[PDB]
C-alpha cells in the first residue's frame, strides 16, 4: 500500500520530475500542482528571517500579537531568548537563532537581554527560551542541559522545533531529513 504513496509523498517538486518519463502525466502533474500550491503558501508566510532584537514596551506586541498572527487560525510561533552575555550557553543559543532564522522564515526568532526582560531575574536560570503561540506559552524551557548543555549542536535545536509543533517531521529543510547529495549518489549506484 505504501509503495504507491511513496511515489508522491516522498518526493518534492524537484524530485517529482524524476517520474515524468515513467509515471503518467495526469497522475504526476495533479500532485505537482498540489505541492506547488503548498510552496506558495510558505512564501507568503515568510514574514521573518533574522533575529528581532527587541525591547520591552514592544514585547507586549511583538511577542504576543504575533503569536496571534491573522487573528483562518493563522498562528505563528515566536521563540524568545532572554540573553545574558556573561553566560556561555547564551552566546551559543544566539548563534542557533540566526542559523535557524535563515532557514525557517515563517517562524519568528526573538531575542532580548534577560536583565531587561523580568525585574530582578535570576542570572543562574539564564539563558531562557520561551515559545509563544496564539498568545499562549507552549514551552517554558530551562537552561540547555536538556539539549546537551555546552555541547549543544544545530541538530539538537532543530529536533526541539519538531517537538513543539513548529516544523513538520518530514520537512526537507531539517538536517535529519536533508540527506547530502553524496549520500543519495551512493544509494543510486548500489541500488
Amino acid at each position: 500500500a505504501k509503495q504507491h504513496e511513496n511515489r508522491l509523498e516522498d518526493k518534492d517538486l524537484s524530485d517529482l520530475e524524476e517520474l515524468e518519463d515513467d509515471e503518467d502525466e495526469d497522475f504526476l502533474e495533479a500532485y505537482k500542482i498540489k505541492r506547488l500550491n503548498e510552496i506558495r503558501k510558505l512564501q507568503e508566510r515568510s514574514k521573518f528571517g533574522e533575529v528581532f532584537h527587541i525591547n520591552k514596551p514592544e514585547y507586549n506586541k511583538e511577542v504576543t500579537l504575533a503569536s496571534q498572527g491573522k487573528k483562518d487560525d493563522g498562528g505563528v510561533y515566536v521563540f524568545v531568548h532572554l540573553s545574558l552575555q556573561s553566560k556561555l550557553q547564551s552566546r551559543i543559543l544566539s548563534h542557533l537563532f540566526q542559523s535557524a532564522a535563515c532557514k525557517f522564515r515563517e517562524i519568528k526568532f526573538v531575542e532580548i537581554p534577560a536583565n531587561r526582560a523580568i525585574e530582578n531575574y535570576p542570572e543562574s536560570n539564564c539563558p531562557t527560551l520561551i515559545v509563544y503561540y496564539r498568545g499562549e506559552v507552549i514551552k517554558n524551557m530551562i537552561t540547555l542541559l536538556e539539549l546537551g548543555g555546552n555541547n549543544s549542536k544545530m541538530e539538537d535545536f532543530e529536533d526541539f522545533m519538531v517537538k513543539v509543533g513548529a516544523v513538520a517531521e518530514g520537512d526537507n529543510r531539517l538536517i535529519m531529513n536533508r540527506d547530502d547529495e553524496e549520500s543519495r549518489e551512493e544509494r543510486k549506484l548500489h541500488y
Binding site: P57, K61, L65
Partner: protein, 527 residues
C-alpha cells in the same frame, strides 16, 4: 464457480439507517411536535411562566419567548425543527408571537390526528387549511381600522401598542416608566431608515432596573486605558468629537520596514524621524481643537500623555458596531488622515459626563437632539434579569418598528382568532363536503389561544368560551378576555391593541409549518 462457502445478502440502505412505512411515522412526527408544544403551552399569556434551560456548557439562560428557548435546545428530530425554524423566522421578520405560532402549528397537527386516523389522506386536509388561510388573511384586513380617521396623536399610538408587548414579562408593573424609554428611543430614529443595530443594549451588571436612564447620546465603556487616564477632565461643556480609523501606534501592526543605514550622523536623524512623524500627527489634530478623539484601532501610549496635557479626552479599541452608532449621533463621517481633517466634520454635544455604575465606568454623551440613534443601559439584579429585560424591550421595539411602517389596529386577547374562526364556520356550512369538517377543525385550532390565557389564569375554560360563543352570535368586535376585572368585555374600552402583521404571519407560518410535515410520510436518518 462461487468464490467461497456462502454469500450474505446486501441490505439496500446503509447499515444503521432508520426507515419506516405506514401511518406510524407521521403520527410520531406529530406527537414529537406536540411534545415540544407542551413545553410552551403554559408559557402563553400574561400570567404564564418562564422556562429555565441549562445547556451542556453549564451557562444559565432564562427566557419567556420561544425564540431562544428552541435555539438553546439542539433539536435532532426534523419534524420538531419545523417549530424552531418558524420561531426564528417570526423572530427575524416581526419579533412577536413566537410562542403562539408554535402553539397554533401544533394544534393544527393535533386536530389533524383523527382525520389521519381516518382513510382521508393528507392531500385533502392540506387543501382545506390552505383554502381557509386565503379567507383568514382577508378577514383580518377587513377588520383592520385606520387611526387617521379619528385624527389622534402620533405619540400616544406607540405607547398604546407597546403596552401589550410588556405583558408576560418581568416589566408589566414597571411598564409605566420603561414604555416611555422605548417609545422615545425609536422616535429618534429616522422613519425612512429604521435600523436594528443602533438599538444595542449593554449587559452592565449591578443596580435595579428602575434606576436606568434614557439619553439620546451613546456610551461605550471605558477601554484599555494606558497610563494617562484619570488626569483629563471627565466633564466637558461643548466638546468636539473626532473619529479616526488610522492606527496611532509606533510601528505596532505596520509591516516590518527593513531600514539600512551607513552613517552615524544619519542614525540620529532616523531615530528622531519616528518621533518627528508621530508628533506631526498629534499637532495636526491639536490645531482643530478636537476635545474627544475616538478610534476603532488602538491609540499609542505617547498620544495619551500628549492629550492628557492639553485636556483632550481620548479612547480606543472601539468596536465597529458601536463606532457606527457614534457617527450617526455626532454627524460627520470617519477620516483616516490627520492632514485631510476639517472643522465641519467634527461633532458636538450640549453636555458630557462620565459616571460609574456597577463598578463600570461609561462615557455618556448628553444633549443631542439632532442624533438619529439611541442607547439603553438596562440595570439589573442578575445576569439573566438584564438579558431577559434586554430581549423584552427588543421585542417592544420590534412592535413599534413595524407599527410605523403600516398603521393597522387589530383586536387582542384571543379575540381576533375567534372572529376569524366563526366566519370560517359560516363559510364551511355552505360547502357540504369533506372540506367542511376540515375547516371546522381549523376553526377549533384557532380557539386554543383563548384556552391557555384562561388555564394560566386559573379560571375554567369551557364555561367562559361558551359565553363568548353566545356573545359572538351577534355582530361584535374587540370582544375577548381580560384579567384585571375578572370579567370579559370590550377590549377597545380596555384600550389594548396589536399590529396586524403578528396575526397574518402567524397564520401563514403556522399553516406552512403544518403543511411541511403533513406533506410527508417518512423520515430517514443515516448513520
Amino acid at each position: 464457480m462461487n468464490f467461497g462457502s456462502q454469500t450474505p445478502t446486501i441490505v439496500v440502505l446503509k447499515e444503521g439507517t432508520d426507515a419506516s412505512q405506514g401511518k406510524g411515522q407521521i403520527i410520531s412526527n406529530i406527537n414529537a411536535c406536540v411534545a415540544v408544544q407542551e413545553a410552551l403551552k403554559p408559557t402563553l399569556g400574561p400570567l404564564g411562566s418562564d422556562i429555565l434551560i441549562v445547556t451542556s456548557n453549564q451557562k444559565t439562560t432564562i427566557s419567556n419567548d420561544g425564540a431562544t428557548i428552541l435555539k438553546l435546545l439542539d433539536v435532532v428530530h426534523p419534524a420538531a425543527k419545523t417549530l424552531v425554524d418558524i420561531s426564528r423566522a417570526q423572530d427575524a421578520e416581526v419579533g412577536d408571537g413566537t410562542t403562539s405560532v408554535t402553539i397554533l402549528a401544533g394544534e393544527l397537527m393535533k386536530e389533524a390526528k383523527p382525520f389521519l386516523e381516518e382513510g382521508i389522506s393528507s392531500h385533502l386536509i392540506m387543501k382545506g387549511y390552505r383554502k381557509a388561510v386565503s379567507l383568514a388573511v382577508e378577514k383580518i384586513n377587513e377588520l383592520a381600522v385606520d387611526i387617521t380617521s379619528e385624527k389622534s396623536s402620533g405619540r400616544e399610538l406607540l405607547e398604546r401598542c407597546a403596552r401589550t408587548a410588556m405583558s408576560s414579562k418581568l416589566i408589566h408593573n414597571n411598564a409605566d416608566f420603561f414604555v416611555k424609554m422605548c417609545v422615545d428611543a425609536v422616535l429618534s430614529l429616522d422613519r425612512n431608515d429604521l435600523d436594528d443595530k443602533l438599538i444595542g443594549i449593554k449587559k452592565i451588571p449591578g443596580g435595579a432596573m428602575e434606576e436606568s436612564l434614557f439619553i439620546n447620546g451613546v456610551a461605550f465603556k471605558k477601554t484599555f486605558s494606558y497610563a494617562g487616564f484619570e488626569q483629563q477632565p471627565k466633564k466637558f461643556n461643548n466638546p468636539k468629537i473626532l473619529s479616526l480609523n488610522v492606527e496611532l501606534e509606533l510601528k505596532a501592526e505596520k509591516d516590518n520596514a527593513e531600514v539600512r543605514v551607513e552613517h552615524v550622523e544619519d542614525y540620529q536623524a532616523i531615530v528622531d524621524a519616528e518621533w518627528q512623524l508621530i508628533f506631526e500627527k498629534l499637532r495636526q489634530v491639536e490645531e482643530t481643537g478636537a476635545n474627544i478623539v475616538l478610534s476603532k484601532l488602538p491609540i499609542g501610549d505617547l498620544a495619551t500623555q500628549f492629550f492628557a496635557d492639553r485636556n483632550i479626552f481620548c479612547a480606543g479599541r472601539v468596536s465597529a458596531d458601536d463606532m457606527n452608532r457614534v457617527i450617526q449621533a455626532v454627524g460627520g463621517s470617519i477620516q483616516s488622515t490627520t492632514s485631510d481633517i476639517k472643522p465641519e466634520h467634527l461633532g458636538t454635544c450640549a453636555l458630557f459626563e462620565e459616571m460609574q455604575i456597577g463598578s463600570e465606568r461609561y462615557n455618556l454623551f448628553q444633549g443631542c437632539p439632532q442624533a438619529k440613534t439611541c442607547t439603553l443601559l438596562l440595570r439589573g439584579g442578575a445576569e439573566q434579569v438584564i438579558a431577559e429585560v434586554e430581549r423584552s424591550l427588543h421585542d417592544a421595539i420590534m412592535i413599534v418598528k413595524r407599527a410605523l411602517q403600516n398603521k393597522l389596529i387589530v383586536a387582542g386577547g384571543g379575540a381576533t382568532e375567534m372572529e376569524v374562526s366563526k366566519c370560517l364556520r359560516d363559510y364551511s356550512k355552505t360547502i357540504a363536503g369533506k372540506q367542511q369538517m376540515i375547516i371546522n377543525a381549523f376553526a377549533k385550532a384557532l380557539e386554543v389561544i383563548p384556552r391557555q390565557l384562561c388555564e394560566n389564569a386559573g379560571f375554567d375554560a369551557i364555561e367562559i368560551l361558551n359565553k363568548l360563543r353566545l356573545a359572538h352570535s351577534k355582530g361584535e368586535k374587540w370582544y375577548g378576555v381580560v384579567f384585571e376585572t375578572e370579567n370579559i368585555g370590550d377590549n377597545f374600552a380596555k384600550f389594548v391593541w396589536e399590529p396586524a402583521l403578528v396575526k397574518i404571519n402567524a397564520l401563514n407560518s403556522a399553516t406552512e409549518a403544518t403543511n411541511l410535515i403533513l406533506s410527508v410520510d417518512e423520515t430517514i436518518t443515516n448513520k
